[PDB]
Amino acid sequence: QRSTSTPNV
Amino acid sequence: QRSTSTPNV
Amino acid sequence: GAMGSMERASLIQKAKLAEQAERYEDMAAFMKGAVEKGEELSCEERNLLSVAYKNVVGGQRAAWRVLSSIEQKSNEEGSEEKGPEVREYREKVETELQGVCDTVLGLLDSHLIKEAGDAESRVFYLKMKGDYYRYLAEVATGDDKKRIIDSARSAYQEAMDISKKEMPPTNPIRLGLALNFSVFHYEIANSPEEAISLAKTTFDEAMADLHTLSEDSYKDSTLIMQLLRDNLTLWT
Amino acid sequence: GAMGSMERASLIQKAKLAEQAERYEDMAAFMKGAVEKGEELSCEERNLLSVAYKNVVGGQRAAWRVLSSIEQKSNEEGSEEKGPEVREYREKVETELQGVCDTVLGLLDSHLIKEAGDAESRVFYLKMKGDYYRYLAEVATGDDKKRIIDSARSAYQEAMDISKKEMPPTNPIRLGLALNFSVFHYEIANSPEEAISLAKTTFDEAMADLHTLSEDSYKDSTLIMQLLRDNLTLWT
Ligand SMILES: *SCCNC(=O)C1CCN(C(=O)[C@H](C)c2ccc3cc(OC)ccc3c2)CC1
Ligand SMILES: *SCCNC(=O)C1CCN(C(=O)[C@H](C)c2ccc3cc(OC)ccc3c2)CC1
Ligand SMILES: [Mg+2]
Ligand SMILES: [Mg+2]
Ligand SMILES: [Mg+2]
Ligand SMILES: [Mg+2]
Ligand SMILES: [Mg+2]
Ligand SMILES: [Mg+2]
């Protein structure tokens, strides 16, 4: 659904 | 490992 | 209290919204505000109170266990000295946990239990009293560990006595009480044989009463019965 | 600040403990305290700051989305009137979210960004500035929506300009910046073609530089590249 942003390190 | 208690309704 | 200006019904509505949003600290604050209006709680409202605080204390208990394990390792015979920080932070989480438990116990004592006359409400609240003393017991180490354990035991026992007199053996509150008292015996009271006996007798007596139930009640009762069985498998 | 009496190193140690315990509100408070000591942050410390606040704001964003969806349904042409509670509680969560974003932006402005001279630190902080303006944009509706969007865009653009000059195309900070700027274009700025173009060019330029990398760096870069590809699949 929503775009993926950078995950947690 | 630990015993199971009553879960949330 | 910061909820003193909000309508009771608005507090309950917002507790349900907070549950949907997985905002359980808010949910607990809303339900505390609802209790402090001074009226008795309905079945659904009691459930909202329980869900809210169980989720809050559940996160605290999980965090405390992680920190206590790290602390125990730091104190292993051969571990590098790391300063006071692990103990300090475990103590911080512990104090917050104890505060949540004290808040719940305070609501039960002022004045939920004393106004609860029906078996469903009184057993629910006494089970809750046992549960939150049990959570205090999980972290207790001082003089008062014994007295905390006895307080949990006493609440659970009063609840058991009422449930056996007033509820059928498949009643889900009666079943969940027995489940949690059996956990108390195994995990807190160093009484695994009592835990096993209670779980087995509870399971068998419920089994024999399932024929009286509708499909929906049967689903509710058998769900908790499976947890008794799960523990019996872990314990034996 | 309540962390003003704690040693910097103790704050960082406790931030790591809080992460292990999944106590991200505590983790953020510890890292805020560490930043307010006034020294620059190391790479690991910057990561702790980012992990803490991303987890905190992530829970708020998820809750806000649930409440906004309920509110939008309550305002559907045919829905029963339910009073002000849904709007009030959405506003409460929104204000808390905006407060977290304002806190992070405040730390960046006082004084993390101005002391950050190396490309790795400056790009990291400008990306973070873009991210927290983007989270403000997600909930903005008033006059300042346009200005919030432009603030996010400006921070991301400054970060992009530095990253293209100073970092190889596989650098994981450069890749994560481009990923998040592409999300900004698609989800905030009504610019899906720009989002797609940026994601594609970023992916292709990284692909062509992977041969320069060790196995461990290759793993890091390709993980983020897969997220670009995931979005390109969603978007096309
Ligand atoms: S400081 C220790 C060594 N370096 C790093 O950890 C880098 C810190 C900065 N950085 C990022 O923020 C980038 C955008 C990032 C973030 C999250 C990631 C998650 C995974 O897999 C879970 C893989 C790569 C990245 C990269 C780059 C790393
Ligand atoms: S008030 C609405 C109708 N009644 C109930 O919901 C009962 C409330 C009290 N109660 C319990 O607390 C028991 C111990 C309980 C708790 C949690 C459960 C979870 C599941 O599956 C997820 C099944 C059964 C129970 C029972 C009984 C219900
Ligand atoms: Mg009133
Ligand atoms: Mg203590
Ligand atoms: Mg007996
Ligand atoms: Mg010092
Ligand atoms: Mg607002
Ligand atoms: Mg371009």
Numbering used by the authors:
A (entry chain B), B (entry chain B): 255 to 263
C (entry chain A), D (entry chain A): -4 to 231
Give the article text.
14-3-3 is ubiquitously expressed in mammals and plays multiple roles within the cell, including phosphorylation protection, conformational changes, subcellular trafficking, and induction or disruption of other PPIs.13,27−29 14-3-3 typically binds to a phosphorylated serine/threonine in intrinsically disordered regions of its clients. Of the 7 isoforms found in mammalian cells, 14-3-3σ is the only one that harbors a cysteine residue proximal to the client binding groove, providing an additional degree of isoform specificity. The disulfide tethering screen targeted C38, a native cysteine on 14-3-3σ located proximal to the natural product binding pocket within the phosphopeptide recognition groove. We explored the scope of disulfide tethering for the discovery of selective PPI stabilizers (molecular glues) using the hub protein 14-3-3σ.
Compounds 5 and 6 were the most effective stabilizers. Compound 5 had a DR50 value >3,000-fold lower in the presence of the C-RAF peptide compared to 14-3-3σ alone and showed a 246-fold stabilization of the 14-3-3σ/C-RAF phosphopeptide complex (KD = 23 μm to 92 nM). The crystal structure of 5 with C-RAF and 14-3-3σ revealed a contact between the naphthalene ring of 5 and the +1 Thr residue of C-RAF. The (R)-methyl group of 5 also seems important for hydrophobic interactions with the methyl of the +1 Thr residue of C-RAF, at a distance of 3.8 Å. An overlay of the C-RAF peptide in the presence of 5 with the apo C-RAF peptide showed no change in conformation of the +1 Thr residue. In contrast, the +4 Val residue of the C-RAF peptide changed conformation to make space for 5. While the conformations of 5 and 7 were quite different, an overlay of the two structures showed that the trifluoromethyl group of 7 occupied the same cavity as the naphthalene ring of 5. Fragments increased the binding affinity of the 14-3-3σ/phosphopeptide complex as much as 430-fold in the case of 6 and 250-fold for our best structurally characterized hit, 5.
